[PDB]
Design an enzyme around this catalytic site. Structure first.
Site, PDB file in Angstrom:
ATOM      1  N   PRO A 174      -3.753   0.617   1.298  1.00  0.00           N
ATOM      2  CA  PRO A 174      -5.064  -0.092   1.875  1.00  0.00           C
ATOM      3  C   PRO A 174      -5.222  -0.159   3.061  1.00  0.00           C
ATOM      4  O   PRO A 174      -6.275   0.141   3.511  1.00  0.00           O
ATOM      5  CB  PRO A 174      -5.186  -0.639   0.754  1.00  0.00           C
ATOM      6  CG  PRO A 174      -3.698  -1.102   0.614  1.00  0.00           C
ATOM      7  CD  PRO A 174      -3.274  -0.002   0.113  1.00  0.00           C
ATOM      8  N   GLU A 175      -4.394  -0.141   4.185  1.00  0.00           N
ATOM      9  CA  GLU A 175      -4.482  -0.606   5.397  1.00  0.00           C
ATOM     10  C   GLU A 175      -4.819   0.485   6.283  1.00  0.00           C
ATOM     11  O   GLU A 175      -5.661   0.468   6.548  1.00  0.00           O
ATOM     12  CB  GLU A 175      -2.706  -0.905   6.572  1.00  0.00           C
ATOM     13  CG  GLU A 175      -2.708  -2.789   5.473  1.00  0.00           C
ATOM     14  CD  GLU A 175      -4.086  -3.473   6.025  1.00  0.00           C
ATOM     15  OE1 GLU A 175      -4.671  -3.663   5.960  1.00  0.00           O
ATOM     16  OE2 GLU A 175      -3.098  -4.728   5.891  1.00  0.00           O
ATOM     17  N   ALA A 176      -4.172   1.270   5.666  1.00  0.00           N
ATOM     18  CA  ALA A 176      -4.607   3.007   6.334  1.00  0.00           C
ATOM     19  C   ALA A 176      -6.163   3.629   5.404  1.00  0.00           C
ATOM     20  O   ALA A 176      -6.556   4.048   6.750  1.00  0.00           O
ATOM     21  CB  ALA A 176      -3.364   3.627   5.570  1.00  0.00           C
TER      22      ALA A 176
END
Ligand SMILES: *[C@@H]1O[C@H](CO)[C@@H](O)[C@H](O)[C@H]1NC(C)=O
Length: 261
Positions: A174-176
């Protein structure tokens, strides 16, 4: 929409890019965007969760379940002992909880719970991983594949092992998706283990602030200076949407209209 899969045991930069593009395309609200950047939906959209199946070089898999509206990881499942084993964070309860449990592991097939006895906040994970900061936990394609092997199908594994796997998966998935900058850190270090730099951590910690600033920006100008950090940890002052846009892949949901292009 169905399960997005990423094969960490047979990956290439192009496959990881495709994976990020699929994740962003399925997570984003079909029409919300500000300054050309897609935005996630409000809390009452058409599809509530996304399943992301990660496969390791061992061929074993772990499937993360993401709340579609804000991309937070609710838990994960793994094939275990001829059952679907679901691991849910300890602050997920009631509806949501059974919704997560059933989405990870349908009640029509064998299943068993293996709680995650802590929540998914970064400081919680860092404590369980035994580090003062997640910048002490390396990220990488091989690391992700190895962590899948250490947990998937295994009757026993420690909280430290699990929390490290979560730190890796959360940041590489998710952060990517939220930040093209993070996706790019993975692509430029594709064949090696790497520690996340200060800019990676600062972007992760300020996604809301950055999303609100872009959403509220007039003629490309942020409401006020946005202080962040450069890759080396030094202060970075952002005044316009175009100075930060290259690093952003998805905006957190922010209510109200905005300059869409
Ligand atoms: C969200 O925005 C609309 C569209 O402007 C407005 O009618 C509504 O008051 C807002 N909701 C909240 C909670 O502020």
């Amino acid at each position: 929409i169905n399960t997005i899969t990423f094969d960490a045991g047979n990956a290439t930069i192009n496959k990881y890019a495709t994976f990020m593009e699929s994740l962003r395309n399925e997570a984003k609200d079909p029409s919300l965007k500000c300054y050309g950047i897609p935005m996630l939906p409000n809390t009452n959209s058409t599809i509530k969760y996304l399943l992301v199946k990660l496969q390791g070089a061992s061929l074993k898999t772990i499937t993360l379940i993401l709340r579609r509206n804000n991309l937070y990881v609710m838990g994960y499942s793994d094939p275990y002992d001829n059952k679907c084993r679901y691991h849910i964070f300890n602050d997920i309860k009631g509806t949501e909880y059974s919704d997560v449990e059933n989405t990870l592991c349908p009640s029509t097939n064998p299943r068993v719970a293996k709680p995650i006895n802590y929540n998914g906040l970064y400081p919680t994970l860092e404590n369980k991983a035994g580090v003062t900061s997640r910048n002490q936990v390396q990220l990488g394609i091989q690391i992700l594949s190895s962590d899948i092997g250490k947990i998937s199908g295994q009757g026993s594994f420690t909280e430290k092992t699990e929390a490290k796997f979560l730190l890796v998966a959360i940041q590489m998935v998710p952060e990517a998706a939220r930040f093209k900058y993070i996706e790019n850190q993975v692509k430029t270090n594709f064949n090696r283990d790497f520690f996340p730099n200060d800019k990676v951590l600062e972007l992760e910690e300020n996604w809301g602030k950055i999303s609100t600033a872009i959403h509220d920006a007039k003629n490309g100008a942020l409401p006020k200076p946005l202080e962040l950090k450069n890759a080396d940890g030094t202060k970075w002052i952002v005044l316009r949407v175009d100075e930060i846009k290259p690093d952003v892949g998805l905006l957190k949901y922010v209510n109200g209209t905005c300059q869409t292009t």
